[model samples]
Target chain A: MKNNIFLNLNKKSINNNHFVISIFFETIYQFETKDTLLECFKNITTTGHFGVIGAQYEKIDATRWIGDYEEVNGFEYIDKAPSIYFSVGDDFNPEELIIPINLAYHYFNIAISDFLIAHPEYQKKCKEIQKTY
Target chain B: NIFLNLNKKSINNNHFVISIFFETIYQFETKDTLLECFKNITTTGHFGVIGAQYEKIDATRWIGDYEEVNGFEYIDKAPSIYFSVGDDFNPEELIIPINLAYHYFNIAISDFLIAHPEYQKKCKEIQKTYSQTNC
Candidate 1:
């Protein structure tokens, strides 16, 4: 049942092509929990006319380390953050994402430079895989 | 009201200014309001704006230099703007904006490999062959 909802949220369009979406959630504040991140992702996809159907998405670690951890004063420790990605239909309008973008920026004070494209190399590799397998 | 805050030290010194561009549109009632907003960002030192010749949708004012250059992207027939900071600034001061951009646009190697299974498989095969040949 949980997987069903995930499939519903990511429903793809009639066209087979997809837009790869990525948002790096830098600097996880004390308040930003996994639940909040999940909520935020839902809000982003459902807001206004920006319907992203039949998409696949995930979240991963985006923490950065400056140096070796074993040596004294040799490394710097940074906080943890979550990175998210989505592959949606090409018909979706990126401009309509402005509201969610603003919301995430103001609410979390997070840094973002999200973009979507056809991704030529990914497309080619996908085709090669289909032919091979 | 847009108030321009010109730093005297930047005008006097040999320090380099930091510049970053954006594709978003921000509307202001007057140039004064625009200046007030940018100046208050507090990344470091005084802030400079360029490509504010075209007002945002239903906006009444222009910010930045008069048509100095086009921004990264366009919205509502208006170009985006470059936000520049000038002063005796150090590289560390750029962390805020740089982090924001990097976080927003980064394509992680792990994520990419996971998302593209065939690509990942191809990469692993290559690595395995190379390791075996070398050892």
Candidate 2:
């Protein structure tokens, strides 16, 4: 069997000289934050998942760049794991990072991107602010 | 929302060396985007930030303090965007093709190199990194 994308980027490496892997999960998602995104990525995600996920969405909006990556595992030559990533859109609202879209979609059924900080801290930063004109 | 259910306990604490890579066609697009994204870390691990992605394409597959090209770069080494933060940071490690998940232990990318030979040493080097999984 020929694997198209390497999911081991989320797995432990350090087993060889500079080894790493990357994956492209969902091509398109309707909602900004789909629950399946969590259901999909819950297995190997660690501290800072929210922040990294938000950043990727923001990055796409800021730069017309395609796709977002989430790292998994650490410090091993052959380290790899259930890492996850996605393809967000440009011109999307960054404030909607945490909001579950009315119509959401999922790219991968799993995600273990990379280590991060306290997610609550990120929530505090990412929480949507309202305006009363 | 899926994020709210992310229990604080589910957060497995570990030292992370992240590399947020991107893929683009322009010279500095990858670099510009990489730095822009690195600064979005609203919380935690602010000490080990680094940049990769050459403004101009070169034989550097992974370009950064954490990157080691080993005299050859990947053929599809363009339009990439990534950043690093951690004590053992590696930008490209997370950038490998996920479809080729077993690539680390297989002859995946190396097989492509062997076919081209343009990256002669790199072909042999990447292949050597694996345990003769294929090809």
Candidate 3:
């Protein structure tokens, strides 16, 4: 009863074939503030659209790192963010998403780059996962 | 409305300027762009990342033909960009415009440099690679 809806999806490749759907295992966010990162992000998820759907805490020493989660000296573990995959088609529209994402990616990238230039000490923990979109 | 935030230091980055560029292009296009973009979403959509909240329909649920009685699949990709209503969810709404396009990479088009010559120097610099006629 729980799995009935996939009747069509499982039966066929579906229309999203030309779409670029990317996926990743897990993304960890390291923080120095003891504030509840999970709860802090619960309401502050920049991942708007559909609010986040799941949460399962893995051990901090779980050894799952992306770029530089553990090497940074000043920071500590606060929570994890999914380095999830985002899909769009080969013929993806520009305005609907491409622009927003493309545009946002640049700004975020520059802001971080500038910050890093000003302060390199905390930059090592900058395990920034690249966005494939 | 989304583009009003642009100014000086804000425009220093290519991606930042690119967004403003998108906003400009957005005004020139039409709605068909969106329906075409999201056509992949259906009442029977499936996925590993977004879950199955998108597999829903409205008024008629299943169908041989389609209609916008409700958004066919889950649109959480970005809450503000898409919305759903009716049927399984009693109806959702598209918070933003629905026309979808690679407006993200619209620069790849033939006439991307038509107006935003500000990017001419940059585009020429990146011309080391090729894609569409513009690049």
Q: Pick the candidate with the highest DockQ.
A: 2
lDDT digits (tens) for residues A23-130 of candidate 2: 122210112243433433342222313323322321122133223221212212112322222222121211122211110112111122221121233232222210
Model 1 stretches with alpha carbons more than 4 Å out: A1-31, A42-133, B1-26, B36-135
Sort every candidate by TM-score, greatest first: 2, 3, 1
lDDT of 2 by residue, B1-135 (tens): 111111111111110112112211111244333233222221221212233222222235545532443212332643322222111332222222222222221332333343445656654554453434323
TM-score of each: 0.17, 0.22, 0.18
List residue ranges in candidate 2 displaced over 4 A: A1-55, A58-104, A108-133, B1-116, B125-135
Give me the candidate number with maximum lDDT. 3
* lDDT for B52 (candidate 1): 19
What are the lDDT scores of the predictions, listed in order? Answer: 0.24, 0.24, 0.25
What ordering of candidates by DockQ runs from best to worst?
Answer: 2, 3, 1
Per-residue accuracy of model 3 over A50-108 as CA lDDT, tens digit each: 21111111112224553433332112322432222221111122111211233223333
Error of 3 at B112 (Å): 4.3
What docking class should model 1 receive? incorrect
Which candidate, 1 or 2, has the higher lDDT? 2
Worst 10 residues of 1 chain A by lDDT: A1-10
